[PDB]
């Protein structure tokens, strides 16, 4: 089987600059002075989308801005200018010889200014109490960088275990990102404390956000 | 303008079997052969084999030779394929794909089909509303939240409105607690619509064919 090396393997890019990802494989890939390497962009949640075929051709409806290159095993994909609806992981896939071969894919993040999370905190609902369980849901909407801290406060002290953190993948229109962090406590347990409080932090600083509410 | 659609998810015992299909249509089926692809939850494509639907020629990507069955139905632009002898690792998605446009890769894709090889039985899920509890409410945006927690097996499809709200949603990916899948939606909209106008959230697990339509009032 022939092997695809894709690098580099994660990549972050401002708006407007170059983005260029390499692919190496470990044998030739051409073929009567045709190139068969082809590459695809895959946003998550959906199949892959066939961007440049044949190591320099552009699918009909694929915005100029794309532009592959190489020939023999080295192949490069160009992006210029850069645009938020390109963060994906890109793939080179031959197909020269059996069995057709993908990359190791490349993640394409974009650069942008930082930005303030959104937090909104959400008390148990009365319909999951009845039952015994009680979540408290925090939804920190929209920030950059992706790295953000968010520490959970019962009755002023900090609630280690119970928690469930869950990223979103860099929004394609304003490029930021989103995390839901839900600590889950039983209904006991949160019917003896008042105060519930979600708060975040970015990397290092010292100035958090914070949301709470009280039983009442 | 060439459509590939693919079945459901699938929930597989392991040691059983699963066939999944891919109408095709757009296009004349016999001129194009029929690819597919596996995909595994870290995200990496793998070839499976194609079929001619034609004469029913195959090929096979040596890896999956014995475990892939692909068939074809001429009268139905239908592919099937087939797995047997499932184990966990045959636990990914699997797109059907073909070369309209001989670009000689890939063109066309389905939507993909989650298989799920697993002993485990059936859970649905707990939909649970989300509302902000006498809050903001004076021309500034407002979030609401729906969680959908303890079902199993993927996937679920959460939607706000009947779809009639796309923009403000964010529906954050599913995580394993115990052995058991959560996942929340959330969506921001002005404080004009809520509690004005109504704000529902519909979760749907294929799984159990459960279907659940929660309203967020405050």
């Known amino acids: 089987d022939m092997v695809l090396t894709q690098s580099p393997a994660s990549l972050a890019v401002s708006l407007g600059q170059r983005a260029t990802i390499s692919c190496k494989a470990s044998?030739?890939?051409?073929?009567?002075?045709?190139?068969?390497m082809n590459w695809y962009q895959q946003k998550p949640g959906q199949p892959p989308k066939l961007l440049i075929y044949v190591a320099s051709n552009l699918k009909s409806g694929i915005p100029a801005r794309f532009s592959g290159s190489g020939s023999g095993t080295d192949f490069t994909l160009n992006i210029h200018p850069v645009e938020e609806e390109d963060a994906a992981t890109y793939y080179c896939?031959?197909?020269?010889?059996?069995?057709?071969?993908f990359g190791s894919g490349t993640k394409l993040e974009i650069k942008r200014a930082d930005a303030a999370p959104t937090v909104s905190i959400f008390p148990p609902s009365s319909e999951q109490l009845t039952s015994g369980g009680a979540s408290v849901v925090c939804f920190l909407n929209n920030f950059y960088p992706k790295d953000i801290n968010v520490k959970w406060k019962i009755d002023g002290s900090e609630r280690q275990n119970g928690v469930l953190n869950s990223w979103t993948d860099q929004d394609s229109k304003d490029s930021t990102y989103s995390m839901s962090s839900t600590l889950t406590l039983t209904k006991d347990e949160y019917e003896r404390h008042n105060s519930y409080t979600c708060e975040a932090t970015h990397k290092t600083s010292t100035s958090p956000i914070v949301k709470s509410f009280n039983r009442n | 303008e060439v459509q590939l659609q693919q079945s459901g998810p699938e929930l597989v015992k392991p040691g059983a079997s699963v066939k999944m299909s891919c109408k095709a249509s757009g296009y004349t089926f016999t001129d194009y052969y029929m690819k597919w692809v596996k995909q595994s939850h870290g995200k990496s494509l793998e070839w499976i084999g194609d079929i001619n639907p034609n004469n029913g020629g195959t090929g096979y990507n040596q890896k999956f030779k014995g475990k892939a069955t692909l068939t074809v139905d001429k009268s139905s632009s239908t592919a099937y394929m087939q797995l047997n002898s499932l184990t966990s690792e045959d636990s990914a998605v699997y797109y059907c794909?073909?070369?309209?446009?001989?670009?000689?890769?890939?063109?066309?894709w389905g939507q993909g089909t989650l298989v799920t090889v697993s002993a485990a039985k059936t859970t649905p899920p707990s939909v649970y509303p989300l509302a902000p509890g006498s809050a903001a409410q004076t021309n500034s945006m407002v979030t609401l939240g729906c969680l959908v927690k303890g079902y199993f097996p993927e996937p679920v499809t959460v939607t706000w409105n009947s779809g009639s709200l796309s923009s403000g949603v964010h529906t954050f990916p599913a995580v394993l607690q115990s052995d058991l899948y959560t996942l929340s939606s959330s969506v921001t909209v002005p404080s004009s619509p809520r509690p004005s106008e109504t704000v529902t959230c519909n979760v749907a697990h294929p799984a159990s064919s459960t279907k659940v339509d929660k309203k967020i009032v405050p």
């Open positions: 044998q030739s890939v051409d073929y009567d002075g045709d190139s068969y």
């Open positions: 896939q031959q197909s020269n010889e059996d069995p057709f071969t």
């Open positions: 794909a073909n070369d309209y446009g001989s670009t000689y890769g890939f063109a066309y």
